[PDB]
Every structure is written in C-alpha cells, then in structure tokens.
Amino acid sequence: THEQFKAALRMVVDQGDPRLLLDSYVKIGEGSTGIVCLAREKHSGRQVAVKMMDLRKQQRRELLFNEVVIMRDYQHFNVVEMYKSYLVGEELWVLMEFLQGGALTDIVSQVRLNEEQIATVCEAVLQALAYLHAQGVIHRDIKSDSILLTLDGRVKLSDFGFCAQISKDVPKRKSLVGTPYWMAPEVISRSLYATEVDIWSLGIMVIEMVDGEPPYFSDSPVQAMKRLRDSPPPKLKNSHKVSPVLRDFLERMLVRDPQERATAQELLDHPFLLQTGLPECLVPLIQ
Numbered sequence: 392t393h394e395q396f397k398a399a400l401r402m403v404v405d406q407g408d409p410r411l412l413l414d415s416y417v418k419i420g421e422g423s424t425g426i427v428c429l430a431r432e433k434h435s436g437r438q439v440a441v442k443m444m445d446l447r448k449q450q451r452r453e454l455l456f457n458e459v460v461i462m463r464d465y466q467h468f469n470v471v472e473m474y475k476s477y478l479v480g481e482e483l484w485v486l487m488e489f490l491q492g493g494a495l496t497d498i499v500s501q502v503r504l505n506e507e508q509i510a511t512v513c514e515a516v517l518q519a520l521a522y523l524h525a526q527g528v529i530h531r532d533i534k535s536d537s538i539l540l541t542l543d544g545r546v547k548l549s550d551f552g553f554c555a556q557i558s559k560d561v562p563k564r565k566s567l568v569g570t571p572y573w574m575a576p577e578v579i580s581r582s583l584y585a586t587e588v589d590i591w592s593l594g595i596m597v598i599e600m601v602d603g604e605p606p607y608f609s610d611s612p613v614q615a616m617k618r619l620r621d622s623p624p625p626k627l628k629n630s631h632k633v634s635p636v637l638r639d640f641l642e643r644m645l646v647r648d649p650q651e652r653a654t655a656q657e658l659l660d661h662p663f664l665l666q667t668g669l670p671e672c673l674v675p676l677i678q
C-alpha cells in the first residue's frame with residue numbers, strides 16, 4: 392500500500408519538514424518524475440536545486456529510492472552532490488547542488504564538439520563510471536541529458552533514478568530499463584546484464600557528441616529498439632570526420648558481446664584519453 396511504501400522510503404531520508412528551512416522557491420523545470428525548483432537555504436543563503444516528486448504518480452515508485460540512496464552512498468568528483476532529502480506530504484524532495492552550465496544535451500543540439508572536448512567529457516564520465524561500477528552500481532540512463540556542467544566546465548553525472556545496485560545474490564538484472572535510443576542490445580532483449588550496458592550507452596553518447604543525435608533518432612523509440620536489438624552495431628554518420636584513435640575508442644564501446652565490450656577501466660587507459668583537455672576547454676560551449 393501507499394503508506395507502507397512511504398514508511399519504507401522514510402527510513403532513507405533526513406528527518407522532518409524542510410519547508411521552513413527554505414525560501415525563495417521558484418520552479419525552473421520539469422523532468423520525468425516531477426519538477427525542479429530553485430530555492431534558498433535560510434541558515435546559509437546557499438542556493439539549491441530541489442527535485443520534487445509525488446510518491447503516488449510514478450511509473451515505478453520503487454525507483455524513488457534511487458533518488459536518495461545512490462547519492463547518499465556514493466560521492467565522486469564527477470557525480471552530482473546531494474545535500475539532504477525529505478518526505479513532504481505525498482512528495483519526496485531531494486536537495487541537490489545547482490549546476491548552472493546546464494546539460495550536455497543542450498550543447499550538442501547546437502554544435503558538434505571537437506575531439507579534445509569529447510575526450511574531456513568522456514574522461515570525466517568514465518572516472519565516475521569506473522568508481523560506480525566498482526561498487527556494483529549500474530547507471531542505466533547514460534545519455535547527454537544526464538551530464539551536467541558547472542560554469543567552469545566541470546562535468547558531473549546525474550539522473551540516478553534508473554540505477555541498479557547489484558549484489559552477490561542478484562549479480563545481474565534483466566529488466567527493460569533505460570532510454571530507448573541509448574539502451575544496450577542485451578537490455579532490449581531482456582537478457583541478464585551488469586555494468587557493461589553503461590559502456591554501450593556511453594558509446595551512443597559519443598555518437599551524440601559527433602553527429603548531434605543518437606542512431607535511429609528519426610525512428611520511433613520502439614522501432615529504434617528493434618534495430619538496435621537485431622541489426623549490426625550502429626555507426627557514426629560523420630565517421631569520415633573523426634580521428635583513427637577516436638574511431639577505435641568508439642568501436643571498443645559499441646560491441647554487441649558484453650564481455651568483449653570494453654570496461655570503464657580499460658577505456659580510461661585508451662590512447663584517445665591522452666588528449667583530454669582542461670575543464671576550461673568546455674567553457675566556450677556554455678557561454
């Protein structure tokens with residue numbers, strides 16, 4: 392029942408009503424589970440982003456635990472910070488850092504990144520993934536929308552709602568979870584899978600950074616999923632434009648066999664990442 396689920400969720404959040412510890416609430420966007428408001432912490436004056444999501448209105452309410460548990464448990468230089476979380480009425484509120492550089496999706500819809508910029512983004516995402524994968528966390532929703540930027544070009548992985556924490560008793564999942572165009576073939580097939588699915592989704596995000604959109608984006612989501620499931624691996628449209636070293640980097644991610652697919656640790660050691668830039672190199676994309 393709703394109250395039973397609410398009581399369980401309550402075990403993982405900070406205690407109390409946060410409404411009087413915040414002011415200046417302004418709605419700044421919406422997302423799949425709810426809204427995001429900017430607000431100000433009275434005690435400190437710190438501006439925070441607050442995700443607000445109704446426990447009754449979700450597709451799969453159990454995934455609300457991920458909104459809190461993952462950032463509670465896991466911290467990293469390239470992972471968004473959570474400050475506090477609360478239950479307010481029938482809503483879960485999660486207080487997060489406000490990243491003012493926006494999402495990578497809003498850059499790639501405008502311009503193509505150069506290779507130094509692609510390597511900078513990939514190195515940051517791979518450091519977060521190597522760390523999360525080592526802890527048994529599968530993200531399951533890697534795509535440019537999940538990548539947020541600070542004003543000085545620091546890259547942070549966000550959107551942990553679809554996460555799976557695997558364990559010794561259930562070391563693999565088989566659920567159909569993700570965003571269609573970025574889902575690995577083994578996820579679409581409902582085969583047992585683990586961390587490798589995030590490497591395939593990162594390869595689709597590299598295609599977004601080179602081409603502007605993922606493969607099959609003119610198809611409906613189900614039709615794209617059928618093509619990803621059955622067809623040979625997708626290619627860059629702009630394959631002619633990229634270095635041999637970048638092409639090799641991407642080829643090692645978009646591999647159908649999940650065992651042969653590169654791990655995050657393997658990719659961190661790839662020569663493509665020898666020419667990663669400084670955070671500053673992304674700042675021209677945000678101004």
Ligand SMILES: Cc1nc(Nc2n[nH]c3c2CN(C(=O)N[C@H](CN(C)C)c2ccccc2)C3(C)C)c2sccc2n1
Binds near residue numbers: 419492
């Ligand atoms: C809304 C918004 N947020 C920005 N900065 C932020 N800083 N911190 C955060 C955001 C947006 N955030 C976020 O969770 N958004 C997702 C959507 N995905 C695609 C990223 C979402 C929102 C509501 C419900 C479910 C999911 C957090 C981490 C709070 C910025 S910067 C310029 C415009 C802008 N507009």
